[PDB]
Amino acid sequence: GVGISTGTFNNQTEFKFLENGWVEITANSSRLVHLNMPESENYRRVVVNNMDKTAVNGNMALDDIHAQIVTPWSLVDANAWGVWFNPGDWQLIVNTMSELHLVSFEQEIFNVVLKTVSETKVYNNDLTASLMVALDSNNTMPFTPAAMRSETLGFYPWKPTIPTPWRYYFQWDRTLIPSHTGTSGTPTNIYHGTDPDDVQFYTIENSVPVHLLRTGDEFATGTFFFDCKPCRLTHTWQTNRALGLPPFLNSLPQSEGATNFGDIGVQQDKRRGVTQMGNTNYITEATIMRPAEVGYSAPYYSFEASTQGPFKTPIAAGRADGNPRYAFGRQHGQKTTTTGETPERFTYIAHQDTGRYPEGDWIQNINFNLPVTNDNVLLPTDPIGGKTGINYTNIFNTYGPLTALNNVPPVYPNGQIWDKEFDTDLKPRLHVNAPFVCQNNCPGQLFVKVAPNLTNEYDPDASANMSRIVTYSDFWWKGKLVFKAKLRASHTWNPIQQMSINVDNQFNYVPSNIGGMKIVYEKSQLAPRKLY
Amino acid sequence: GVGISTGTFNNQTEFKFLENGWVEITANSSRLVHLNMPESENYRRVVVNNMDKTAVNGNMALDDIHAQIVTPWSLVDANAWGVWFNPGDWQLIVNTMSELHLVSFEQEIFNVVLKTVSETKVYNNDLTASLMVALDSNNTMPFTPAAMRSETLGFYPWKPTIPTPWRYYFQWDRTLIPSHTGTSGTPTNIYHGTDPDDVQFYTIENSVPVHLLRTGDEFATGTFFFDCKPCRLTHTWQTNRAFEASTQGPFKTPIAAGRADGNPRYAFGRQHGQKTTTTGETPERFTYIAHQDTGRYPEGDWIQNINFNLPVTNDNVLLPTDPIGGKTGINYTNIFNTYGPLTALNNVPPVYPNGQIWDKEFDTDLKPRLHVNAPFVCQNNCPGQLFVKVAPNLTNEYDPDASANMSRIVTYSDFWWKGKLVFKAKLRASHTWNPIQQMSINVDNQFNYVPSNIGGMKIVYEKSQLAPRKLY
Amino acid sequence: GVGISTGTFNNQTEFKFLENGWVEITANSSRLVHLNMPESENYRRVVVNNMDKTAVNGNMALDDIHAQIVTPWSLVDANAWGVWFNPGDWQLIVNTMSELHLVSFEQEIFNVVLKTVSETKVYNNDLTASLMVALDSNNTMPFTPAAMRSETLGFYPWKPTIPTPWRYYFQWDRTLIPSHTGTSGTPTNIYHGTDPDDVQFYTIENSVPVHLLRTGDEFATGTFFFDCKPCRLTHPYYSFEASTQGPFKTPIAAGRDGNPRYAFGRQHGQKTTTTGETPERFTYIAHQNNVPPVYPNGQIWDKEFDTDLKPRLHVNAPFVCQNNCPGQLFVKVAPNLTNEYDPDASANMSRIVTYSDFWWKGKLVFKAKLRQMSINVDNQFNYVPSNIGGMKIVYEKSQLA
Amino acid sequence: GVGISTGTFNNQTEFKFLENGWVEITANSSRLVHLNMPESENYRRVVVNNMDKTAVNGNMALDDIHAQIVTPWSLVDANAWGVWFNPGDWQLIVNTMSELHLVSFEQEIFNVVLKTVSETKVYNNDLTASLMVALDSNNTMPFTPAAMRSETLGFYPWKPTIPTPWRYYFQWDRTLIPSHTGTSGTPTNIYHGTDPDDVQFYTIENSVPVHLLRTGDEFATGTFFFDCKPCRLTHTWQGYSAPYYSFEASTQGPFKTPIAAGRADGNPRYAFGRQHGQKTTTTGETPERFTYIAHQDTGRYPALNNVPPVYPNGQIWDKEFDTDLKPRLHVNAPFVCQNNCPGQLFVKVAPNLTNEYDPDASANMSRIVTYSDFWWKGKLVFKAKLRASHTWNPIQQMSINVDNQFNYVPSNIGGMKIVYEKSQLAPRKL
């Protein structure tokens, strides 16, 4: 009936210790989700067009033009680490466990309450109204991970949260020919409408079943089961220079201090080993053959254009090029007592040395005369196309059959957990936004809406928008996300880097006088691992 | 559903007589517990400082500096004698029993009502709203017996009661070098913040399973079972003739048996024994002069020289009259400590109605031999503290990116709490020719035990260990 | 749920004839019972003293002095003949029956309704509030026959009734030396307070269980079986003794108050449409060893004394329970508290003004043995309604033969 | 609970045909019934007296003196033909059938709604209040047929109906010597109160069980089974006489001698309101009337044949007299309940008291203004024999024609009426 609860709030996380060094980490997350009725019941098609800001030359990268289908429904997205683990739990994971698997995910909506507002304001319960709830178990709707906008559920168990108003991209065609400031004339900045071939208009009602929960009953998702490959919570330091057998040292130092270097015994042209430079006798640490290349130079801050306008070419590993910058609000880590629209921001400087240092690169001639003359070496000081600001490494790619790379580290609290794999015939090696990638199917997106609570005046033939009783709902959401992880072992003599509270970072992890809270970013790959 | 009563009120107590002179004393108690929504929904970390009062010299003892996590939850606590027994039941216990054992404790929250106020005031039901209830069965949270502040459930079956807003200590560092009036200058009185090594921020949500109870629901704490050693309800007459500081600042070194010092003074309010029709904020107070005569008497103790010449000369005897440290007012008995391998002590008596029943044993490697505040000490585990909080009834205007405190429909709950506490007690036997002292109603104490014209009750303290016992 | 009926009203009397001239008489009675909040939620101890009147010489007999524990609980008492039989049923009983046995008794509370008042006035329901009901099956609480104070349930099936606010005596000591008019000076007339040996402060909360019925729930006593002897339907003046409690009239076992004089209000037989505070009154001049039943105001049963030696008859009831008597039923609207309650504040708790209407249904079984009262022109209009809905129940004799 | 519907509306007349020429006719009827709270919760002994109108000499027939017990309870009565059969089904019955047998009657009160009125007026539900329902299965209470006061349930399934407030006769003694215009002296015209031998103050509470239906409840009564002799829908054309317009004087004043046969005198003249066949959109207080000129020629002009049915206003059944010797017929209903009759169903809304109540105050109690609406469903089962065409010629039949056409279909402003229809049509050989 009305007065009987239908579920238990639970935000614990158990660590269940299995045989042979595995821990099943069960993350439970519970949230009171608050949902206003939509602005309009009708699906809208809206084009955004900042021609005004892109027509001023040089502002090519600020291109916000897109089309989207604004939708009445709202989405409950739990795909972020902060929804599940607190800083203590994340510490216990990263400091002690070497690899991490997803196992399962499930959701429950329970204890729905519906309320109506009447004008002072009086709030009255509507026992007859219903929360409309839909689960895309089949992944027929366009996937929309809310972490890329920081519109996931809130990361504090106590605060209530709100679901993201749903929307998805529509077709559009655009050309934006770039232009520096001081260009002679206006480039062709124009919007070409939409290709009829590419139209896809989706609706929740026609695509998936919908449940009219009312105040007294639950919605529950079956246990979805992942099959993803392990994310590894440990980072690799070995550049190409640090793979294989180091040279033998003949004059070892005989006293302490940095001044007392050791020296290889024999001249560089009389050394022995394998180089991959057929015409050159010099065997050096730069020239000696290595098994393969760790990381790759990629053309940095390259913007590339399709039918739908320009976009940045992503890069798999950063050195600050490549490293991700997260901007986030007060639900999701910023100090809740701060005023102002301005988001808090961090840049995740990962530990791993799979990146590149472009200012150190160079290319030189096949002849390889040793003290290379000016005409025979292209340096990062040298201009391509006469542009002093654009050296060759900006326009340069060395991906190849020998490139080795790591998956992106987890970013706590804002980074995605899982991502859907593309339906392309040829699929990318990695996704730069989440560690785990769903191979064949991914957890169904959960859509919520409050039903149209009509008034007596309604006439469908009237042109104006329908009159609705102003309704809102609160529903408790409970998630259970299960991981399986392997405890580390101390192979080295020396201890490893670890996350720790200290005098500097102390008060980031406890509330303030007026109860303000924050969640700082914590690095997810601390222990070093052996690449070779 | 809504309209069905989900549990029965019961405040009886049953003396069920077992074989071999034992009794199962079962004490049911039931209360109407009134709960407002939190002052603010979020956890706060609040530092109290009273440098204004301690900086004036000689007021070292008045140090109140601490840090605490103010928590939206409220705590329901039954760890006090007056919750369970009325003066007649206690009379029967103290006059008839020789020893007392704790057996079991259980709880139920039942008949939850949720109500909201709209502006004059008009009062409406919210059948959809829910009371959050959490039981710390594994004792993850710090133990906080409300009896030491006199914030337990009320001691009257019929009056309603309130749960104490929960809070717990958060680590702080402090130094307060003591000084007398007439010291040269202000001594070191500074608050050093918090050691990062020691931070512990607990939340009910991350630690305890939280039950939501709408108006039709129940939450029964299952029967917990104690294993504590007996508490003697008898006092030994025989004797042998037959401030310190640590990281957090100064505290008094407790004493196990008073004569004075060492005799506990209890300050309590109108829920907890004060004449309920009194006026003003002043607490009612008693000092518990226990019967047990094992406590020493410093005004009659002296040290004398090993030579032990009978009429002592002055330099061969130390008296309480003699200064130590040049102080006219302090003598050797203040520094003197006699505790050694030979020392024997009795466990602390029960203090009706304000005293605790049980306390959690310390998780130190080496345990104290007794606790002053409770007669029973939970060794392996203790009954889980029960936390309550009405869930946030939000308005339509909520936006979590807004920094200001969330708007909430003013909501309050009245829920009935029931508990059953079981004791096992042994009857006494007359060994002496003479009778023993027994508590009774007399011409003096008569009107303490019955209401007044305007319906005002009081509960007077009653001595527990009335009958004498042989030490040896 | 809320909207489901939880019992059936019944006010029929069933005559069921058994073997050998015995007949079972089952008197069902059902009343709508109205109950306000307690005046104050606390137990009070209140002393009545009327020295203003009894200090006048010659007023020894007008001594109202006592002490009592005024209690929030209210008592539902059915212990009077008028609650069970209308005058036609009593006519059958007295005309045809020779002797009467009390067999069994049961009660139920059902169809509880709780309502609240917001001030004009609007009467909103409260489905969450509850009615406390308690039953003293073990006879822990002091026995309180409401029929002596004319405080039972009402005698008409259709008029709603109220329970009596419960109270019980607290010990006091008094001396009142009697004096006549024309005495030389004031006699000794003083109140000594209370003896500590005699103190007994009972509470319903500590002594008996309590059921917190909301609205959709019922309460039933088990059927109680009496042990009582049969009642037969066939046939120093003004000496006052001083206890420690003060002076009291010595009861006299037989008639020519003298013969018992009953004073009663509109619920209990006075013409319902008559005005004023003045009660209706009669004196029951019996024809006659044991006391007769008095219809409608007389008691049915009483409990025997706890003393070792026990009275041979009770002047106030025909039947006397020897081992134990039916449990008294107590009721109390639970505290419907406001949001501002501070229990450490001195003042009384602020309560939402709430009231309850609940239906009481009793069954009482008798056994009688078959062995005249009649309507005539003078008494004709006593047993029928008046033009404006008036009603009365006149007194009727019992030991006719 | 509250939100679940308890039973289903049904107003279908079902004709089930059994060979050997017998038809089982099941008249389902369903109504929405509206009930206000009583004027007072008290039983009241009211004497009516019109000595003013009867003191004018010659006005003996206008005598209206009686005593009655006005009762808070209200009566749901379905004992009339129009409650069950629409005119088309009645046409089928009178045209095709020859005789009828009553088989059974059952009733239900279902989907109860209780409401309260607050002062503009604002209407609120009261889920806790209850409707008191009482069925007198043992026939303890006096029999009160509502048809002769035109107080049965309404005849249209769509219009909601009200139950009649219940009342019954209390004994009185009244002498009225007759007179005429020009009589010199005032005749004896006085009221003698009542004699104690005849006093009977019945009350529902003492006589019947009562069920307190809240909102989710139903009160389905049992299935009563009649045992009456057949009623024949065919008239003889081939008698007895009596004193025209005689009045007899028992102790309870003059009353007309009923005449068992018709031709005006003997032909019953009905008078009825808007629920019971008058054009619903007519204004004014005047009732619509017809005189039922029965076809049968048993009367004479200045067993014998039974009274015919009078659709829509006439009774269906009636109690047999409790006297030792019993009448040969009743002038009001075709069927007579030989030794038991269906329980009268009494309905009341229980007192919804206010907080200020004091039962020792003399004034009337202060109740919350509450009213109920409850659905009523009944099922009346008949057993009937199809006729046979023994004559050469066709017999008279009920039919629609250009004159009576617009009696049977509604008007533009939504009006309806039910004109009477003659029941006994086919001639019968004596």
UniProtKB/Swiss-Prot annotation, chain A:
Record-listed Mg(2+) binding positions: N138
Compartments, record wording: Virion; Host nucleus
Main location class: virion
Keyword Cytoplasm: no
Keyword terms of this UniProt record: Capsid protein, Clathrin-mediated endocytosis of virus by host, Cytoplasmic inwards viral transport, Disulfide bond, Host nucleus, Host-virus interaction, Magnesium, Metal-binding, Microtubular inwards viral transport, T=1 icosahedral capsid protein, Viral attachment to host adhesion receptor, Viral attachment to host cell, Viral attachment to host entry receptor, Viral penetration into host cytoplasm, Viral penetration into host nucleus, Viral penetration via permeabilization of host membrane, Virion, Virus endocytosis by host, Virus entry into host cell
SS bond list: C438-C442
Keyword Disulfide bond in annotation: yes
GO molecular function annotations of the record: metal ion binding; structural molecule activity
GO biological process, one term: entry receptor-mediated virion attachment to host cell
Recorded GO CC terms: host cell; host cell nucleus; T=1 icosahedral viral capsid
Family: Belongs to the parvoviridae capsid protein family.
Subunit structure, interactors included: Interacts with host TFRC.
Comment text on domains: The N-terminus of VP1 is sequestered within the mature capsid. It contains a phospholipase A2-like region and nuclear localization signals that might be exposed by capsid modifications during virus entry.
Extra remark beyond the main annotation: The capsids of autonomous parvoviruses expose a proportion of VP2 N-terminus and part of that sequence can be cleaved of to form VP3.
Function per UniProt: Capsid protein self-assembles to form an icosahedral capsid with a T=1 symmetry, about 22 nm in diameter, and consisting of 60 copies of two size variants of the capsid proteins, VP1 and VP2, which differ by the presence of an N-terminal extension in the minor protein VP1. The capsid encapsulates the genomic ssDNA. Capsid proteins are responsible for the attachment to host cell receptor TFRC. This attachment induces virion internalization predominantly through clathrin-endocytosis.
Protein name: Capsid protein VP1
Organism: Canine parvovirus type 2 (isolate Dog/United States/CPV-b/1978)
Part of the whole protein covered: 180 to 727 of 727
